[PDB]
Write a protein that binds this ligand. Structure first.
Ligand SMILES: [Zn+2]
Lengths: 279, 48, 70, 55
C-alpha cells in the first residue's frame, strides 16, 4: 500500500514558527515537533508547530523530552489544539536540506511511532532574501529498495514537476529518504493579515520624500545621462554595419530615463495634490 | 564585531588586540627609588 | 513579471556578499574568481554587471553561499 | 531544574581558547582568540566570573 507522489501542507503560522525557531538557534541545530492531521493517503496537513528546548545531546531522539512534549500537548488541547504529532523538524544551518545518519535514526523512531509521519529540514541562513529553503522527507524502507521497486506509485504528473536539488542526493536523497512536495495552505484571511507588514499607510502614501535629496538624485542621474549620451554618440558612430557582436549606452540610458521620469512625475503630482488638498 | 549569521556590524570596539602588550605593560618592577640606585647621579639626572 | 524578476535580481546582490579578486573570464556568462577565503572558484557572473568594468585584478563581490559573482 | 539544564548544557568539547581584553560594557564583555585561529567577541562571558579571567 505504498503512497504516491502525495503532498504536504503547512500553515503559514507553522512556516513562520519554523523560520523563527531556525534562525534563533543558529549556528546550533534546533528541533521541534509538528502538530497536524494526516487527512488521507495523498496529503499531510501540519497546522501548527511548537519548539522544544535545546540539549547538549544535539538533535536526536535523546533530545526529545517526553515529559515536555506530553505536558505541551496536554496544555494545547485545553486551548484549541487537539491535533496529534504528525512529524518533527530540525534546522540545518550552513548546508542544504537533507537527512544525516542521526536524522535518519530519528525519522525511523518517528516512523515506529507512526505510519507515515514526515521529517522537515529547514536551512535558516540559506532561506533568506525572500527565497525559502524547506524540504520534507520520509525514509525509504530498505526492503522495498532491496527488491528493485520504485519509491512510490507515480500516478499523475504531480510530483516529478519538481526537481531534486543536486546537493541532497549526495547526502542520500532517493536512496534512503524521498522528498515529498511541499505546499502552503494559506487562506485569503492570513494573506491579507500578513500583507499589513508592508502595506502602505495613507500618510506614508502622501509623503513627499525630500526636495533637496530629490534634486541631488536628479543631478546624479543626469550625470549618468550625459555620460551615456556621449557613449550613445560613440555607439551610433560605429554604424558601419560590421558583424553583430545593449551594453554601454542603450540599456543604461533607457532604464535611467524611465526611473528619472517616473520619480519626477510621482513627486510633482503628489506635490500638486497636497497643494490642492490640505488648504 | 559582526553577527556570525548576517555579518552585520553591531558594535565598534576599543582599538586592537594582543594581550602580549597587556603583559608587557602590567609588568610589575617593584618599588625602586632612585636612591636605591647608587653612583649614577649624572646618568639618572640625564635620563629624567 | 519582468519588474518582479529585476527586483529579485537586485535582491541577489544585497549586503552580505563576500569579496574576491576577478581573474580572467571564461565565457559571456561565467568567469574565474579568486576568493578572499583563499580558494578559487569557477563562477557564473550576473548579466547586469558591465563586463568592461571587469579586469584581471578587479575587486569583485561573490555570493556568500553560491559564490556567484555579482 | 536550572542547575540540571545548565549541566546537561555543558557539553564536553570545549575548544580551548585564549582570552583577550575584557572591554567594558556599554549599551562582562570578552574578546576570544580560538585554538582554531579565529577571534570572537562575547556580549556576555558565560558561566565564569569576569575577574577570574586574565587576558
Ligand atoms: Zn539533521
Amino acid at each position: 500500500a505504498v503512497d504516491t507522489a502525495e503532498q504536504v501542507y503547512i500553515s503559514s503560522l507553522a512556516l513562520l514558527k519554523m523560520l523563527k525557531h531556525g534562525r534563533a538557534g543558529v549556528p546550533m541545530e534546533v528541533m521541534g515537533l509538528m502538530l497536524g492531521e494526516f487527512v488521507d493517503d495523498y496529503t499531510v496537513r501540519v497546522i501548527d508547530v511548537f519548539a522544544m528546548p535545546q540539549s547538549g545531546t544535539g538533535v536526536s531522539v535523546e533530545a526529545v523530552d517526553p515529559v515536555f512534549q506530553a505536558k505541551m500537548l496536554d496544555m494545547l488541547k485545553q486551548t484549541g489544539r487537539p491535533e496529534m504529532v504528525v512529524g518533527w523538524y530540525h534546522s540545518h544551518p550552513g548546508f542544504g536540506c537533507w537527512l544525516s545518519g542521526v536524522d535518519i535514526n530519528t525519522q525511523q523512531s518517528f516512523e515506529a511511532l507512526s505510519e507515515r509521519a514526515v521529517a522537515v529540514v529547514v536551512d535558516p541562513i540559506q532561506s533568506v532574501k525572500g527565497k525559502v529553503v524547506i524540504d520534507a522527507f520520509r525514509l525509504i524502507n530498505a526492503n522495498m529498495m532491496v527488491l528493485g521497486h520504485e519509491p512510490r506509485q507515480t500516478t499523475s504528473n504531480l510530483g516529478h514537476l519538481n526537481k531534486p536539488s543536486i546537493q541532497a542526493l549526495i547526502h542520500g536523497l532517493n536512496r534512503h529518504y524521498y522528498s515529498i512536495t511541499i505546499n502552503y495552505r494559506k487562506n485569503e484571511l492570513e494573506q491579507k493579515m500578513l500583507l499589513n507588514l508592508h502595506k502602505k499607510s495613507w500618510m506614508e502614501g502622501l509623503t513627499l520624500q525630500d526636495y533637496s535629496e530629490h534634486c541631488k538624485h536628479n543631478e546624479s542621474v543626469v550625470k549618468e545621462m550625459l555620460e551615456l549620451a556621449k557613449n550613445y554618440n560613440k555607439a551610433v558612430e560605429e554604424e558601419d554595419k560590421m558583424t553583430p557582436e545593449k551594453q554601454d549606452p542603450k540599456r543604461h540610458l533607457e532604464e535611467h530615463v524611465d526611473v528619472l521620469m517616473t520619480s519626477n512625475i510621482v513627486q510633482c503630482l503628489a506635490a500638486m495634490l497636497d497643494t490642492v488638498v490640505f488648504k | 564585531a559582526l553577527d556570525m549569521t548576517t555579518l552585520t556590524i553591531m558594535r565598534y570596539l576599543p582599538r586592537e588586540v594582543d594581550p602580549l602588550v597587556y603583559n608587557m605593560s602590567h609588568e610589575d618592577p617593584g618599588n625602586v627609588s632612585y636612591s636605591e640606585i647608587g653612583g649614577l647621579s649624572e646618568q639618572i639626572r640625564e635620563l629624567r | 513579471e519582468f519588474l518582479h524578476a529585476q527586483e529579485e535580481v537586485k535582491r541577489i546582490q544585497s549586503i552580505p556578499l563576500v569579496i574576491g579578486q576577478f581573474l580572467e573570464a571564461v565565457d559571456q556568462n561565467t568567469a574565474i574568481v579568486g576568493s578572499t577565503t583563499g580558494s578559487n572558484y569557477y563562477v557564473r557572473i550576473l548579466s547586469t554587471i558591465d563586463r568592461e568594468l571587469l579586469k584581471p585584478n578587479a575587486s569583485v563581490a561573490l555570493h556568500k553561499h553560491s559564490n556567484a559573482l555579482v | 531544574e536550572n542547575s540540571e539544564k545548565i549541566k546537561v548544557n555543558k557539553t564536553l568539547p570545549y575548544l580551548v581558547s585564549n582570552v583577550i581584553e575584557l572591554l567594558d560594557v556599554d549599551p562582562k564583555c570578552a574578546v576570544i582568540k580560538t585554538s582554531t585561529r579565529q577571534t570572537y567577541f562575547l556580549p556576555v562571558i558565560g558561566l565564569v566570573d569576569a575577574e577570574k579571567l586574565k587576558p
